Amino acid sequence: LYIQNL
Amino acid sequence: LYIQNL
Amino acid sequence: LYIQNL
Amino acid sequence: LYIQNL
Amino acid sequence: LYIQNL
């Protein structure tokens, strides 16, 4: 599970 | 589980 | 579990 | 468990 | 458990 918020 | 908030 | 807040 | 707040 | 607050 990988989450990136940019 | 990887979370990055940028 | 890895969290980075930048 | 790794947390960095920057 | 590693916490850095910068």
Author numbering:
A (entry chain A), B (entry chain A), C (entry chain A), D (entry chain A), E (entry chain A): 1 to 6
The authors write:
Needle-like crystals grew from 0.1 M acetate buffer, both in the presence and absence of ethanol at pH=4.8 and diffracted to a resolution of 1.70 Å and 1.55 Å, respectively. Crystals grown from both solvents contained β-strands of parallel orientation, but arranged in different amyloid topologies. In the monoclinic crystals grown from the ethanol containing solvent system, strands arranged in the class 3 topology could be observed, while the orthorhombic crystals grown in the absence of ethanol contained strands arranged according to the class 4 topology. Similarly to the class 3 structure, hydrophobic residues (Leu and Ile) form a hydrophobic niche in this arrangement too, while polar side chains of Asn and Gln stabilize the interface enforced by H-bonds. The side chain of Tyr2 forms H-bonds with chain termini. Due to the parallel orientation of the β-strands, Tyr ladders with a distance of 4.8 Å between adjacent side chains are formed in both crystal structures. On the other hand, in the class 4 arrangement, the Tyr side chains face in the same direction, so that inter-β-sheet Tyr-Tyr interactions could not form at the zipper interface. Although the Tyr side chains also meet near the chain ends in this crystal form, the interplanar distance between them is 7.0 Å, indicating a much weaker, if any, type of interaction. While the class 4 structure did not contain any solvent molecules, the class 3 structure contained both water molecules and two ethanol molecules, one in a solvent channel near the chain termini and another wedged into the steric zipper interface. The two polymorphic structures with distinctly different topologies are thereby stabilized by very similar interaction patterns.
